[PDB]
């Protein structure tokens, strides 16, 4: 086509979706990770995670307001990944890398799994 | 912070939200523009438009499944802008620029209004 493109549009959209998340505006699901609860937008979760895409396209699970993750999932690792979904920024640290990688594999977040594998390989 | 950032994340999120729109997955509102209807995600509309942000943060309108725009709004101009919201690409043409600019002013989409004003100024 003969379209023009606004370079910052995608980043500005995500920044606004994160602002809605911070103010708990139009969040439509609670993700339960053991004793912790995380409110989010189903559409953002699906856009970032192969697991959430599969969950919310299911004819029964699409209507659930609460999703319980596997008990092996670490709430801090989930929190780091939820923040990454809404910001593009990943708080990857020596102390959390194993939990973040395990959570990203479970959530099917391929690019996160890739950088975790590379950061681990560098320290061995 | 000491975060790392994935450059393409925001673009990939928006691409996936557009895929959900194309398959009519988790759309939660119909925007009525005269005889035409447009299905969308309230969160994406709010993230792109000052008017939709104001509408869906209203304690009564947040719960509406149908929103009727002003009868002066052109359905083609709205369609072009809805596509821009989900893609960052704007199909701006000599034949549609007046309708697109009028629709972007109504929707409160400041960057679109700005490029329309500049493209009009160049042709005068």
């Amino acid at each position: 086509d003969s379209c023009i493109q606004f370079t910052r549009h995608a980043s500005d959209v995500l920044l606004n979706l994160n602002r809605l998340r911070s103010r708990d505006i139009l969040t439509d699901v609670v993700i339960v990770v053991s004793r912790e609860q995380f409110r989010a937008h189903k559409t953002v979760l699906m856009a970032c995670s192969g697991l959430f895409y599969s969950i919310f396209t299911d004819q029964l699970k699409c209507n659930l307001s609460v999703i319980n993750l596997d008990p092996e999932i670490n709430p801090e690792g989930f929190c780091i990944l939820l923040d990454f979904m809404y910001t593009s920024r990943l708080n990857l640290r020596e102390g959390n890398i194993m939990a973040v990688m395990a959570t990203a594999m479970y959530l099917q977040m391929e690019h996160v799994v890739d950088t975790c594998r590379k950061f681990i390989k560098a320290s061995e | 912070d000491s975060c790392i950032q994935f450059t393409r994340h925001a673009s990939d999120v928006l691409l996936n939200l557009n895929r959900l729109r194309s398959r009519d997955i988790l759309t939660d509102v119909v925007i009525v523009v005269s005889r035409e209807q447009f299905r969308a995600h309230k969160t994406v509309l709010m993230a792109c438009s000052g008017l939709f942000y104001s509408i869906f943060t209203d304690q009564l309108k947040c719960n509406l499944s149908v929103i009727n725009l002003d009868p002066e709004i052109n359905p083609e101009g709205f369609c072009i802008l809805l596509d821009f919201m989900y893609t960052s690409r704007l199909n701006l043409r000599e034949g549609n620029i007046m309708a697109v600019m009028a629709t972007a002013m109504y929707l409160q989409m400041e960057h679109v209004v700005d490029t329309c004003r500049k493209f009009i100024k160049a042709s005068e």
Binding site: C3, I4, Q5, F6, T7 | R89, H111, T115
Partner: peptide, 4 residues
């Protein structure tokens, strides 16, 4: 704005 750019030519994509």
């Amino acid at each position: 704005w750019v030519i994509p």
